[PDB]
Amino acid sequence: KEAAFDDAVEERVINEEYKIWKKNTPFLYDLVMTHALEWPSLTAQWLPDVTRPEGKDFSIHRLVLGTHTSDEQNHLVIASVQLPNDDSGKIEIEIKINHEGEVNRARYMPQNPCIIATKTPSSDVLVFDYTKHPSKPDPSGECNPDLRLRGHQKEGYGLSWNPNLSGHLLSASDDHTICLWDISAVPKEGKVVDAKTIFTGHTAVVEDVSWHLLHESLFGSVADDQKLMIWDTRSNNTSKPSHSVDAHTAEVNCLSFNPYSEFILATGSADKTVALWDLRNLKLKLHSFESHKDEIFQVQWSPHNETILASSGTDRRLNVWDLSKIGEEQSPEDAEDGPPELLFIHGGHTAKISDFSWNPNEPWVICSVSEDNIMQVWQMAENIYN
Amino acid sequence: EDSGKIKLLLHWMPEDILPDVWVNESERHQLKTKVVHLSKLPKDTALLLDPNIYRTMPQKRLKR
Amino acid sequence: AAARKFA
Amino acid sequence: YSFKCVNSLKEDHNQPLFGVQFNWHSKEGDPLVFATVGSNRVTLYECHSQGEIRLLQSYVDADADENFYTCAWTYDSNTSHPLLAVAGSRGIIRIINPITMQCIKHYVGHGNAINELKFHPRDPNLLLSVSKDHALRLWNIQTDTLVAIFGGVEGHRDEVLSADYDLLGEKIMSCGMDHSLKLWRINSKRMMNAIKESYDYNPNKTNRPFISQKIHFPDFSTRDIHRNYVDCVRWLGDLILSKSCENAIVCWKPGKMEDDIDKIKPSESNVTILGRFDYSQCDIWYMRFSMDFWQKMLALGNQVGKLYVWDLEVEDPHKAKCTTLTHHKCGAAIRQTSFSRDSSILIAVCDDASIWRWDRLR
Amino acid sequence: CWRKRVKSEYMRLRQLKRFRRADEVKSMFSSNRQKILERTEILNQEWKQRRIQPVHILTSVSSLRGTRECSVIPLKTLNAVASVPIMYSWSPLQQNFMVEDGFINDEIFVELVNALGQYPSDKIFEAISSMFPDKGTAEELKEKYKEL
Amino acid sequence: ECTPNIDGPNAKSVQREQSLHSFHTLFCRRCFKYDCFLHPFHATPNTYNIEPPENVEWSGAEASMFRVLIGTYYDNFCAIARLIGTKTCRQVYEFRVKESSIISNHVYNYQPCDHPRQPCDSSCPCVIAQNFCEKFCQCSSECQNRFPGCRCKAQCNTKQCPCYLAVRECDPDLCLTCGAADHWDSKNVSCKNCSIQRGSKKHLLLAPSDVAGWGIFIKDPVQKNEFISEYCGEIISQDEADRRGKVYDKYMCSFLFNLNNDFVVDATRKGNKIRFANHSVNPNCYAKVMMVNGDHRIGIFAKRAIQTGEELFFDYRYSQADALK
Amino acid sequence: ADHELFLQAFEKPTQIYRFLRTRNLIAPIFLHRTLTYMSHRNSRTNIKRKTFKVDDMLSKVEKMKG
Amino acid sequence: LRIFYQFLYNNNTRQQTEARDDLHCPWCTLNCRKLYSLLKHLKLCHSRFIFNYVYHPKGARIDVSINECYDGSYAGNPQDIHRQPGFAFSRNGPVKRTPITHILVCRPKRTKASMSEFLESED
Amino acid sequence: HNRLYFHSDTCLPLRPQEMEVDSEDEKDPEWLREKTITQIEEFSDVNEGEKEVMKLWNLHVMKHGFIADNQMNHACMLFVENYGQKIIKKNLCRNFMLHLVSMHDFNLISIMSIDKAVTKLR
Amino acid sequence: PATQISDLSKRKPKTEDFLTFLCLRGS
Amino acid sequence: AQRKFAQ
Incomplete structure (x- = not known):
């Protein structure tokens, strides 16, 4: 074909980009650590479980990976990374856990930061507890669901715990469905368990969902209806949300909220853009960003900075924005590079970027993962914010 | 001691030459103008129609 | 001799 | 017999051609392809009645320090498309589809040049191949595996130059720069099993490579036919034709003048020279010869542009009929000749690039 | 008188040997020829079963624009595929291993002493000595006679 | 007969x-x-x-x-x-x-002492070699020129085990405390001067070098003076070494290694992976010509710590007019 | 002399960089302002504090009729 | 400031030298300011070849040489990429998951860089 | 990067599914067996049965790889316990008895070993 | 010296329309 | 020294 030949020369182009990227890495970053995983993750999430032994350079943080795989046993993972502090290291896996299916998403409960959860290509979601599983699997051993959930009909990519409450948990799918569970209720035998409540607002695949970080009853929801619904629970109308907005032109994937604010809400999308509304007026798209080249899958505000934000997707680039810098009348060269609110671009990944995450407990560090089994963690240079 | 093998395959190179020539004919980014044709940005979204590959996917068929 | 290695 | 130089092409690179081969896997009467190899080029051709050789296609590969010095033909079992396997110094085999016009499949196993290729005449997938790594190997193209290595402790002491299946394809000979000549088999249950396994493999399912069924031991070895190097070798039915740098082709059989071939066993140390075709003026190596699909004629080039061609059905049968066919235009060295499915057409590509299509009366 | 006809026996067996062998070898050729015809016929059947969709010119009805060319045809290049360095074949171990460091046949010679024995003996060793450069010492050849 | x-x-x-x-x-x-x-x-x-x-x-x-x-x-x-x-x-x-x-400080190769009517005297073949009278001698059982053994509890790797001074390894019919004999068929044992014999070699890997062609990379990490493998080959004469070295400089690639004053190892036609150890004068491995049961074998030992994926080398110790390879 | 070989050499690295020029002007790998040695660019300094952001200056009374 | 080049091929062959229009990247058309910035751009972003300078009599000169080494390889799945036979899964095939050996590459640790871009003005 | 790896028999490339502690290196190379076998057969001045028994013992030795003397008092027992089936398929009992005596002559074992061996056999 | 970096712009365009003096009379 | 090429 034409296509099959364009998309070989492309791969050659990719490598050429990559090597020049590498030769400039001292001059863009303060740290990078590329690790080639043995199977691709589709998921990341740091933990707050920091530690720093004494007379040292570094601390140790933790990851929560997954695994997409061809045939073998999927098993989710929890790494330990190792980075210097003030004035080198390596990262390794330390605890693996078998998994019926593959791992689409996985987010830890912030109340107890060991009770992680997980989606699967099966309709069900799971819950684990890496206390009560061994540090490695073995066939003689046996992995219980360690609590199992149920309520969908198909799979998806949306999870969320609610940091205001404990145990409350939200999900999503292509099932046109947003299910809600509580687990503080039955820590009995009760392995399987069904909805506190479902919701059916959307009329397309619903891609993401998340709780608002200050109210206890308040979560967004984002679909390929082009839409954005905002549900308040404790209303009991499970197809009529409080607020709604036809947001973007194309599909909508990501939904996000700003921690240091109370009414702001970023949002990603497959019209190569990012939008940030405000709850007090959902009709008014405050701003938009226009420097991606393909659909977007993840947007994450950063903590330690109210005002900044980060985005990724198919186009192999993870961008970081900034809202202070908006409207800044700029030299022609600046426009020659990119708009001003755009702050940094990370061109390290030679494939789609499946997920990424900021960490708490360091200022500006991101882990970012791919589909070529690569995992970078990187701290952008210091001379860009000061 | 050791060179290594260049990945750029001299079967790509023709399809760098050809579209380059299609371009210097059409949109004349070398002769009629400077090496920078316009400032090149202001269009934003249909700049990918010259060439075939200002940006293509790794993959057009995808799991998610 | 034709070049041989030692320990 | 008698041939006539109806035509004589020349290339547009001015480096020697080494390899030339027909496609004996043509349709009935549909015209006669043949491939020429050179310094980095593969070069098909179409010949019309009264010459009019047709230059169909021409392939090049990147490196200038490669030199494709041999080709060979096969077909696909399922799809019925010709293919074409080329190789040389850079040390790789690859497979052309003149239909899709693309190098679909390569095989990077050898340690050096690949001075020959062949295919198992029954089974079009079992590409033998022979290298300057002291070792033959035997691939299987359609699963992209390595079935065997007919090399080892006893396989060879010096590079290798030629090989040849027999008509049944149930046996094989290796020729070498170690002044030597050997047999192998394919008929052994061991080796048949290896091949059968090779068809029945799939790297997705397993978690373990295919096992390259090595063979360190031959079925015969002599160093008393020849004294200098050895260039080619041919299974004239169940006799062995094999030349050298000593001005004559030799026919022989292993053992004494009546003993069977299947019951020769590795301890056998007896030769039997029962024929000798003679010529003059060759004192260099890699100077092949060839035969037809009926094995009725034997064409041998020479370094002086001279041909020789021999009949075989009781001419002498081993002493009369030398005949050199010529012209003073390529007085340059002829490496490799050929024939087609009939003994009509003859080529002799030469050291100054020229392609000398002969033809016979009638 | 004896020695004359001894050399004459030598010169006659030079023809007798080939005359005996010729029938044998040509019988071999004939047998081999039968085999060849049988086999090649089976292969020819195999050839005539199969049809292969033969080759013709490149038909890039399009894309013949300014690329490399022959002489004249475009020069349809191919992939630069990665090499591997150079190995010489070798066989594994696990322990060590030790290793240490014109035309004439005696058949026609014994055939000649039989041609003498079929119908003092120094006459038939001292004549063969006076033309061989590097054989020499026909007393040893008579020691061979006593043994062989 | x-x-x-x-x-x-x-x-x-x-x-x-x-x-x-x-x-x-x-x-x-x-x-x-x-x-x-x-x-x-x-x-x-x-x-x-x-x-x-x-x-x-x-x-x-x-x-x-x-x-x-x-x-x-x-x-x-x-x-x-x-x-x-x-x-x-x-x-x-x-x-x-x-x-x-009805009625000079060269080494010579071991050749067992055999005596009809004397002890392992100065006239003994083994004594004149300056090599001990190993257990395959036909020397008397009380031969002072034999070897005693070792008296170490669990390890023999240091300069403490007497086997180590003059380079030998724990011959398991004299070294009964160390752990040489034990695990007659099994291998899990604490003595770490029994490595060659049981052939506790490392899971090496072959891949293309970054100096000269092919090269060899350990997969799993090691520590100083740990055992990597043995330098297998073909044990042949010195003159044979010379004949072959001529035609191998003609090839321009050499695998020859010296064993003693009389014998030489060639891994060219046959040997193990560890013949692909590239050259360097910044090596991370080295070579001991170790006696084992009268047989001069060769041990390749990590000269320092190494981690996953590293390359191995060693001081070939030659003029090296040819390529380092 | 042979210019031919010289050209054949320098032609491979040029074609590449031209191609990359025409991309990275559109789809950049990274930025040429987020960088040490190109400190020249980026007339700006990391300063402003903002969150209460809604200015909503969206008068825009334009509509159609027909 | 002017700018000149000089094309070294085998150390004593043709140059066909140069003298640019501006202080931009003749390749990538970037617009640096200093010579420092230029040379760093030039050594990093175009390191298929190699760059020297007196910088000039009149603040301009550069010398260029086609790089020998470069390490112009493939970076990806070292297996199923560099040798998958030329089918639809040859060089890339990221159509689904595959394994790699666990590798690990730490590109920078924590940089020690002076305010001055001169270091390159000194080197 | 930790780079591409090859098998050492073939020089085909090595998948990571197969780096897999399976090491393509092992005590009994699959040819040295055949060499030692075909090297026995060369011996003119010896017996068929004898040769057969020798081959079986050599193969056993190559497999397990014994070093010590004590190990022989174990190895004889091992050898019978493994290849008595084959010996009985051939019926070489007398030869094996002779072999055991031959071992004993080298001070490698005692009468106990011999008796135990044949008893295990029968 | 003469002949601006359009030299580069005749290495990619040697043939098929490279134009005017410098780009044709480069070497 | 049997050369490969003829002069």
């Missing part, structure tokens, strides 16, 4: 020597295998009435069986009857009676 079967009907009875000469000379106690490769040896070998009768037939070469078991078993009672098919001790004794009544 051949005979017929003893399994077979064709069983011409013969002397004890006459039914052992085959095994007598085809076997190497130094190797524990019949016709060993690196054990060529074929010379004049040193050492190795009142009651009625039983009218029983001694079949073909049951004579031979009884005859050879006779010198050897010192006249057992029932044993010989258990072993031979279905015979009777009375028949055995009568048959015995029928038979009775």
Whole structure:
């Protein structure tokens, strides 16, 4: 074909980009650590479980990976990374856990930061507890669901715990469905368990969902209806949300909220853009960003900075924005590079970027993962914010 | 001691030459103008129609 | 001799 | 017999051609392809009645320090498309589809040049191949595996130059720069099993490579036919034709003048020279010869542009009929000749690039 | 008188040997020829079963624009595929291993002493000595006679 | 000096020597295998009435069986009857009676001391070699020129085990405390000077170098003076080394390694992965020519710590006019 | 002399960089202002504090009729 | 400031030298300011070849040489990429998951860089 | 990067599914067996049965790889316990008895070993 | 010296329309 | 020294 030949020369182009990227890495970053995983993750999430032994350079943080795989046993993972502090290291896996299916998403409960959860290509979601599983699997051993959930009909990519409450948990799918569970209720035998409540607002695949970080009853929801619904629970109308907005032109994937604010809400999308509304007026798209080249899958505000934000997707680039810098009348060269609110671009990944995450407990560090089994963690240079 | 093998395959190179020539004919980014044709940005979204590959996917068929 | 290695 | 130089092409690179081969896997009467190899080029051709050789296609590969010095033909079992396997110094085999016009499949196993290729005449997938790594190997193209290595402790002491299946394809000979000549088999249950396994493999399912069924031991070895190097070798039915740098082709059989071939066993140390075709003026190596699909004629080039061609059905049968066919235009060295499915057409590509299509009366 | 006809026996067996062998070898050729015809016929059947969709010119009805060319045809290049360095074949171990460091046949010679024995003996060793450069010492050849 | 079967009907009875000469000379106690490769040896070998009768037939070469078991078993009672098919001790004794009544600081290679009528004196071959009188000597059992063994609890790796000073390894019939003998077939053992013998080699890997062509990379990490593998090959003469070295400089690639003043190793035609160790004068491995049971083997040892994926090298210790490779 | 070989050499690295020029002007790998040695660019300094952001200056009374 | 080049091929062959229009990247058309910035751009972003300078008599000169080494390889799945036979899964095939050996590459640790871009003005 | 790896028999490339502690390196190379076998057969001055028994013992030795003397008092027992089936398929009992005596002559074992061996056999 | 970096712009365009003096009379 | 090429 034409296509099959364009998309070989492309791969050659990719490598050429990559090597020049590498030769400039001292001059863009303060740290990078590329690790080639043995199977691709589709998921990341740091933990707050920091530690720093004494007379040292570094601390140790933790990851929560997954695994997409061809045939073998999927098993989710929890790494330990190792980075210097003030004035080198390596990262390794330390605890693996078998998994019926593959791992689409996985987010830890912030109340107890060991009770992680997980989606699967099966309709069900799971819950684990890496206390009560061994540090490695073995066939003689046996992995219980360690609590199992149920309520969908198909799979998806949306999870969320609610940091205001404990145990409350939200999900999503292509099932046109947003299910809600509580687990503080039955820590009995009760392995399987069904909805506190479902919701059916959307009329397309619903891609993401998340709780608002200050109210206890308040979560967004984002679909390929082009839409954005905002549900308040404790209303009991499970197809009529409080607020709604036809947001973007194309599909909508990501939904996000700003921690240091109370009414702001970023949002990603497959019209190569990012939008940030405000709850007090959902009709008014405050701003938009226009420097991606393909659909977007993840947007994450950063903590330690109210005002900044980060985005990724198919186009192999993870961008970081900034809202202070908006409207800044700029030299022609600046426009020659990119708009001003755009702050940094990370061109390290030679494939789609499946997920990424900021960490708490360091200022500006991101882990970012791919589909070529690569995992970078990187701290952008210091001379860009000061 | 050791060179290594260049990945750029001299079967790509023709399809760098050809579209380059299609371009210097059409949109004349070398002769009629400077090496920078316009400032090149202001269009934003249909700049990918010259060439075939200002940006293509790794993959057009995808799991998610 | 034709070049041989030692320990 | 008698041939006539109806035509004589020349290339547009001015480096020697080494390899030339027909496609004996043509349709009935549909015209006669043949491939020429050179310094980095593969070069098909179409010949019309009264010459009019047709230059169909021409392939090049990147490196200038490669030199494709041999080709060979096969077909696909399922799809019925010709293919074409080329190789040389850079040390790789690859497979052309003149239909899709693309190098679909390569095989990077050898340690050096690949001075020959062949295919198992029954089974079009079992590409033998022979290298300057002291070792033959035997691939299987359609699963992209390595079935065997007919090399080892006893396989060879010096590079290798030629090989040849027999008509049944149930046996094989290796020729070498170690002044030597050997047999192998394919008929052994061991080796048949290896091949059968090779068809029945799939790297997705397993978690373990295919096992390259090595063979360190031959079925015969002599160093008393020849004294200098050895260039080619041919299974004239169940006799062995094999030349050298000593001005004559030799026919022989292993053992004494009546003993069977299947019951020769590795301890056998007896030769039997029962024929000798003679010529003059060759004192260099890699100077092949060839035969037809009926094995009725034997064409041998020479370094002086001279041909020789021999009949075989009781001419002498081993002493009369030398005949050199010529012209003073390529007085340059002829490496490799050929024939087609009939003994009509003859080529002799030469050291100054020229392609000398002969033809016979009638 | 004896020695004359001894050399004459030598010169006659030079023809007798080939005359005996010729029938044998040509019988071999004939047998081999039968085999060849049988086999090649089976292969020819195999050839005539199969049809292969033969080759013709490149038909890039399009894309013949300014690329490399022959002489004249475009020069349809191919992939630069990665090499591997150079190995010489070798066989594994696990322990060590030790290793240490014109035309004439005696058949026609014994055939000649039989041609003498079929119908003092120094006459038939001292004549063969006076033309061989590097054989020499026909007393040893008579020691061979006593043994062989 | 051949005979017929003893399994077979064709069983011409013969002397004890006459039914052992085959095994007598085809076997190497130094190797524990019949016709060993690196054990060529074929010379004049040193050492190795009142009651009625039983009218029983001694079949073909049951004579031979009884005859050879006779010198050897010192006249057992029932044993010989258990072993031979279905015979009777009375028949055995009568048959015995029928038979009775029928009457410079170079190194040289090890060659066991054998003495008809002396100890391992100054005239001893092993003593003149400046090498010990190993257990395969025919020296007397009290030979002072032999080796004592080691007296270490669990490890012998340091300069504490006496095996290590003059370079040897724990010969498991003198070193009984260390752990050399133990795990006769199994391998999980604490002594770490028994590595060559059991062949506790590392799971190496072959891949293209970054200096000269191919090269060899350990997969899993190690620590200083840990064992990597042995430098296998073909043990041949010095002159053979020279002949082959000529034509290998003609190839321009060399695998030769020196063993002693008399012998040389070539891994060219055959050897193990660890022949691909590239050259460097910043190496991370090195070579000891270690005696093991009288056989000079070669050990490749990590000169420092190494982690996953690293490359191995060593000081070839040569003029190296050729490529480092 | 042979210019031919010289050209054949320098032609491979040029074609590439031209191609990359025409991309990275559109789809950049990274930025040429987020960088040490190109400190020249980026007339700006990391300063402003903002969150209460809604200015909603969206008068825009334009509509159609027909 | 002017700018000149000089094309070294085998150390004593043709140059066909140069003298640029501006202080931009003749390749990538970037617009640096200093010579420092230029040379760093030039050594990093176009390191298929190699760059020297007196910088000039009149603040301009550069010398260029086609790089020998470069390490112009493939970076990806070292297996199923560099040798998958030329089918639809040859060089890339990221159509689904595959394994790699666990590798690990730490590109920078924590940089020690002076305010001055001169270091390159000194080197 | 920790780079591409090859098998050492073939020089085909090594998948990571197969780096897999399976090491393509092992005590009994699959040819040295065949060499030692075909090297026995060369011996003119010896017996068929004898040769057969020698081959079986050499193969056993190559497999397990014994070093020590004590190990022989174990190895004889091992050898019978493994290849008595084959010996009985051939019926080489007398030869094996002779072999055991031949071993004993080298001070490698005692009468106990012999008796135990044949008893295990029968 | 003369002949601006349009030299580069004749290496990619040697043939098929490279134009005017410098780009044709480069070497 | 049997050369490969003829002069």
